[PDB]
Design a protein around this ligand. Structure first.
Ligand SMILES: N[C@H](C(=O)O)[C@H](OCc1ccccc1)C(=O)O
Ligand SMILES: N[C@H](C(=O)O)[C@H](OCc1ccccc1)C(=O)O
Lengths: 426, 427, 423
């Protein structure tokens, strides 16, 4: 009778896992029991996170090669530039919403910071041209064996274009060899999609465990000013999803409610996994088999959007800037806010592919608007206070990042006349 | 007697000859005072052999494991399939466990002590067993290939093989063709690795000679006492394996074990005399057909699958030899990496070759998974050279229990399915 | 547009424009502007060229060694190693000759200071001969190591060609699909190289512009004779040694150079022989006519162990720092220089930064040690100032030697397709 578990449709099976995990974590971590949760429950969550991370590199390499090798380079270039301008616009609007909400909700009214060696991170912004040079891999195998997503994107696209140029050639040997290499990569991509199907069949347990641990450990650090911060962040995220993405899908024809009902599979995996590059397998599978997007559009726009299009992250940064500026007692004016917007939009590009860049971008936005992040200063104390409930903030903004990647893929597909209209209508 | 003739002598006996010649050469050149004269003019060949052996460890556990897992996957396992595969895996696990038990009991490799210290960076932090299990799933399979990890890539290869079979069972044409081609690529890689591991095993005599010569010249340690102890321990472990494992597994599934022994006598003797698990496949097929009583289907499907994935003798030999290496180089194994040895030996038993070097390579893989660097010069390489320089005796001993387990599993799967007639068993 | 031109001699007019504009930007004091707004293109080109070295080497070598008999492969290897040793020795000989000619390091006031002094860590020859065997081939691919990949690809290609001659069927149809995978990979890599050569003019221009900007102002006085000595040594090395070897083995010198102007100009600015491997392999196969059996096993090996212009620079630098600290050498010390230079070319292949270690060996072999504070570590810190403009040409010659030796071994092995060589 175990099969009923494995034979349960996973659409309304994740949400139940997530909600029951939230309830269990809140009723456990409120009675002083987070230790048993972290020792006996959270291993399942970490196993699920690692099971998802295991697929991100083979899936991106294989699917991207098979896609780019099935698309004319002109279409690939126009899709690239369209999705890039879309990503910049969405990050800008997300920081705009973040600042608007932070000013509205009056986040950080009286933070009442203490005294101590606050958390500080040396900004050290990598150069922009240096980052655009790091997109080219000095070694493709070393860029595979390091978890970097952008260099392998570049190499996979180049290899796909070369492979289709080969399959356009005239000599039988080279054409057959190109076809065989493409069949290898196709089999690899499809095997990875099947493994993703299996992992998502297992996913309710991992989602339960993860959300239970997260809402149990930090289910009590949400009080007073931290409660204000988490409320303002989640309100900004819900307003980004319900205003910007809804209007952008409604202006290009895509029905918003349908897109959300279909992306609820890769949304509740991001909201819990707390990594946009982690849930890349789930979102690529959902954009291929629940949206009807050509494998040349989503396979290019989802992995890139997993390292560039950070909307929830940009919103969290734009609102924690207001929080820290109100904590130190020197509020932000109406021009420094535009500087924050520009600097966040530019930092999302300047940290494209850098691992652990969740704090470098915040250091950039704080340095460019005068708030030096030198340690021991009150600004470091407020940033450490935020890093406190970060684990409960890092949940929603990952969901917003992945929903943004998906909405960008869907829009670029629909505007390029390669979106399956059959599985959209009812 | 040129080197062209040297390539026709059997590999395992060449290796034992090389180890004995290395013993006598080290003794002579150490008593005459030529230690520094063999650490530079003889040792490089041993280091070359170690670097040539450690190379095939990663491309084998990636390709061979994929093909293996793609030959036993649940996408093509009916009732008999799963019921024999769970048996093969459980018996391999209990065989590695018996290897560990009898190795710790006999205290294998305690009078060799060729290690520098009793621990400097190892045996200083406890690896959480839960966190050690969550290291099976790799956060990046290519990073676990390029970093030289054996268990994460084994898990990823198993998962890829199962996925590829589930693809090959798909009604579509493009994806089925793609899965066929990917499996053919991995099959070709595994086969090329088997060719290269045959060449390396042909080179292995000179490497074992150089390593043992350097050891016995520099250090006065002898490799006869502990090695006879390891031989005795592996054979006692095989005896305990047969008796305990198969007699309980039979008496629990309604079978008289004495008749099982008196009937599999033929296959046991011929496997012990041929030193090959597959070279005795016709004989064990005949014994299971006309002397045991199995029907054509079961003894035609399980016996080849058992010739491929079901290996207890090699599993027990690893469970004893990794413990010998641990107790030899100085710092023994914990309780959180004995299970890593068990898991790696088991999950590696599902992808095998049959080539002579199917124990040496599947022991380098274990020595890398549990974590014991085979770095050239490190005492792990020297103790592994010792334990590989006697592959003949252990091989001839364990090839018997391999096919013994094959027959026991075939008869078990038959008797839990009512397809073996009683006219051959009941008197 | 822009792609409508034969790039055979568009790289030349990229290079000349780059050199003149770099000299101008250096004369006018603008090195910052060029390094900040021009060198990005050069670095993009260098990375586009390095991106292919490992896949092109692996695939090309496997496909080649799976279509050649191991005995023919061994004969080819012996021939090419003999050639590499001979050319390294003769290059050091030419370096010493032209150094004594120009009186390198005749007089120069060093000036006491810190001075560059790298710790000479000389590995034994046996260690750098065992390091050719990879402990883990994927770890050798993921580390930029070319020689372990050479070994693994050679033995894998031989194993594949041994499988494709087996009476079995499931393995005969499975070791010919892996071979076609590697064939497709090598072909796609040659296509990507042919697509990068379109951008190669901008890259060459930017690279040589930056290099002639930041160094074109330092080549004055006693530091200006050493560059003349190195470049006259390189020109003499080519025009004498390579032309004599070619005209002896039948190959045409002039046609050879006119055929190599694609992988000499893109190595004279890439400043890395192991990085310009894709372009030189493509140019060998598609302009010289060598089959994938010779130019895939000899070209990366020559990019790793053959250093002709580098050894000429070692000879010139040895004579420089010897005549500059007031210590002239002798004929015997010069023979020592030559032999230690060849043995350092061999017994250093593989370790990163191998360009400052073999120099330490060829210096310690004459009595001048790289000790910090000593006059040698102050007389060599000065010759290191112009190392870019002194390394460009010697990388050019390090690659021209690879091409010449590949063509020599080919024409000796009848592999050289004689239809691509006469018009
Ligand atoms: N939550 C996301 C994630 O963990 O992937 C996000 O990741 C940080 C990041 C990493 C790389 C590039 C941009 C942003 C974040 O933490 O803000
Ligand atoms: N960079 C030059 C070249 O590759 O030709 C050469 O560098 C030596 C070198 C560099 C890297 C690896 C091996 C040898 C030199 O400076 O003379």
């Amino acid at each position: 009778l175990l099969r009923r578990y494995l034979d349960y449709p996973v659409l309304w099976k994740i949400l139940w896992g997530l909600v029951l995990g939230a309830v269990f974590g809140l009723i456990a971590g409120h009675f002083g029991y987070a230790g048993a949760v972290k020792t006996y429950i959270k291993p399942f969550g970490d196993l699920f996170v690692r099971l998802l991370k295991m697929l991100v590199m083979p899936i991106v390499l294989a699917s991207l090669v098979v896609g780019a090798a099935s698309i004319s380079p002109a279409r690939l270039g126009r899709v690239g530039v369209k999705i890039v301008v879309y990503y910049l616009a969405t990050s800008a609007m997300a920081v705009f919403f973040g600042l608007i909400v932070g000013r509205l909700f009056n986040v950080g009214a009286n933070v009442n910071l203490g005294s101590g060696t606050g958390k500080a991170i040396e900004a050290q912004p990598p150069s922009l041209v240096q980052t655009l040079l790091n997109i080219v891999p000095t070694n493709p195998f070393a860029s595979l064996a390091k978890g970097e997503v952008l260099p392998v994107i570049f190499f996979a696209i180049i290899l796909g274009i070369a492979i289709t140029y080969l399959m356009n050639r005239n000599e039988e040997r080279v054409r057959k060899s190109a076809e065989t290499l493409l069949r290898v990569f196709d089999g690899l991509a499809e095997a990875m999609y099947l493994i993703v199907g299996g992992v998502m069949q297992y996913a309710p347990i991992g989602v339960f465990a993860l959300i239970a641990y997260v809402m149990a450990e930090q289910g009590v650090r949400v009080v007073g000013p931290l409660a204000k911060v988490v409320g303002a962040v989640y309100t900004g995220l819900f307003l980004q999803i319900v205003i910007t993405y809804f209007i952008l899908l409604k202006v290009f024809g895509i029905d918003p409610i349908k897109f959300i009902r279909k992306a609820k599979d890769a949304m509740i995996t991001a909201f819990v996994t707390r990594s946009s590059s982690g849930t890349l397998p789930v979102t690529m599978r959902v954009a291929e088999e629940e949206m009807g997007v050509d494998k040349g559009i989503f396979s290019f726009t989802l992995p890139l959007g997993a390292t560039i299009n950070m909307d929830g992250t940009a919103l969290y940064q734009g609102v924690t800037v207001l929080f820290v500026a109100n904590a130190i007692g020197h509020p932000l004016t109406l021009g420094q806010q535009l500087v924050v917007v520009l600097t966040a939009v530019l930092a999302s590009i300047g940290t494209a592919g850098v691992p652990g860049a969740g704090a470098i971008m915040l250091a950039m936005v704080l340095q460019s608007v005068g708030l030096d992040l030198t340690p021991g200063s009150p600004v470091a104390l407020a940033y450490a206070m935020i890093l406190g409930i970060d684990a409960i903030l890092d949940m929603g903004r990952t969901m917003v990042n992945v929903t943004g990647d998906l909405a960008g893929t869907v829009i670029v597909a629909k505007t390029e006349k390669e979106l399956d209209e059959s599985k959209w209508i009812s």
